[PDB]
Amino acid sequence: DIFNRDPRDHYDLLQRLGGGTYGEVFKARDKVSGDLVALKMVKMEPDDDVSTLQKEILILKTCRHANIVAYHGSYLWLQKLWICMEFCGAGSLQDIYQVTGSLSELQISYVCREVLQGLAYLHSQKKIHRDIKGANILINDAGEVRLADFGISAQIGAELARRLEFIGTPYWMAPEVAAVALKGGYNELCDIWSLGITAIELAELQPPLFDVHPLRVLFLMTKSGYQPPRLKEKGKWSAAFHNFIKVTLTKSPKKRPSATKMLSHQLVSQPGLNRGLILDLLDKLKN
Numbered sequence: 001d002i003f004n005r006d007p008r009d010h011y012d013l014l015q016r017l018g019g020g021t022y023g024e025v026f027k028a029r030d031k032v033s034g035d036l037v038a039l040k041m042v043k044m045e046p047d048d049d050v051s052t053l054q055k056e057i058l059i060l061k062t063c064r065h066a067n068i069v070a071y072h073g074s075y076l077w078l079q080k081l082w083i084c085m086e087f088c089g090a091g092s093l094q095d096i097y098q099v100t101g102s103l104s105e106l107q108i109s110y111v112c113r114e115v116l117q118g119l120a121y122l123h124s125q126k127k128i129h130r131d132i133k134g135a136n137i138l139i140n141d142a143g144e145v146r147l148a149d150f151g152i153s154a155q156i157g158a159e160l161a162r163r164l165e166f167i168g169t170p171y172w173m174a175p176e177v178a179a180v181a182l183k184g185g186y187n188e189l190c191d192i193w194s195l196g197i198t199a200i201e202l203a204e205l206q207p208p209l210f211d212v213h214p215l216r217v218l219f220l221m222t223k224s225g226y227q228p229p230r231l232k233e234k235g236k237w238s239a240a241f242h243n244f245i246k247v248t249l250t251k252s253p254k255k256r257p258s259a260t261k262m263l264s265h266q267l268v269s270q271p272g273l274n275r276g277l278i279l280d281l282l283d284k285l286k287n
């Protein structure tokens with residue numbers, strides 16, 4: 001499952017694509033097949049024994065779904081874990097919309113249906129993604145939609161930095177998650193709220209309150225009279241899209257629908273939602 005060797009023995013390392021709390025990601029090519037892959041270098045905590053690491057790589061391998069970037073293999077080299085993953089040629093939805101402008105309502109509907117399929121799978125596996133946003137939804141050259149990873153729950157690498165990252169950028173978290181360090185916990189329904197915010201982000205190029213200081217957003221979201229956000233231009237979007245935002249952004253998690261329930265919402269169950277809508281979006285990159 002995990003190779004005790006240099007990933008460079010099986011791959012040619014190419015350009016660094018980006019990096020964050022999840023690791024450093026590079027473009028790479030398989031030496032034998034010639035196929036493009038993404039190699040992600042994750043620094044390890046010296047306290048995590050190889051049994052702890054193996055338990056997490058087994059999860060990385062078994063927690064599999066068509067709407068989550070596929071895992072190919074791993075390498076333990078120089079106290080670092082290199083993860084080989086499916087190459088998503090068009091980058092994230094943020095990378096795309098910061099060139100193309102706002103996605104169409106049908107494009108957002110397709111993205112939302114595909115992300116809901118991935119979240120319904122992760123929730124069935126008793127995981128909470130807790131990192132849904134446009135930058136963490138990747139697009140391949142075929143127009144397919146994939147979550148970059150299964151979220152923050154990997155008990156390897158910079159887990160603590162990943163877990164606390166939203167405190168400095170809380171715009172996509174549900175109010176029960178924004179109530180950080182208070183007695184109430186949260187459940188998987190926080191992902192449904194994050195998907196509602198991501199739909200507004202795809203429509204408006206930023207999530208609601210993006211211009212507000214992160215500590216002020218945390219202050220506002222724990223106030224009793226806090227109201228969920230809405231789309232800015234009412235006449236630009238259909239009643240179905242406004243209702244999708246209304247129900248995904250239900251303030252109380254005890255009233256917020258599940259990922260499976262959301263899949264029958266009119267916005268994402270309508271006919272004509274396919275990768276061709278995203279192929280049209282990728283065609284806009286050329287102009």
Ligand SMILES: Cc1nn(CC(F)(F)F)cc1Nc1nc(C2CC2)c(-c2cncc3c2ncn3C)nc1C(N)=O
Pocket residue numbers: 016017018019022025038040069085086087088089090091092095135136138148149
């Ligand atoms: C082909 C390409 N282009 N771009 C745009 C850029 F500007 F970075 F180059 C990005 C890619 N590819 C990827 N980039 C990333 C991130 C460096 C941007 C990840 C990635 C992996 N693990 C966790 C992640 C990731 N993203 C967010 N989280 C939480 N994966 C892929 C990929 N599989 O193709």
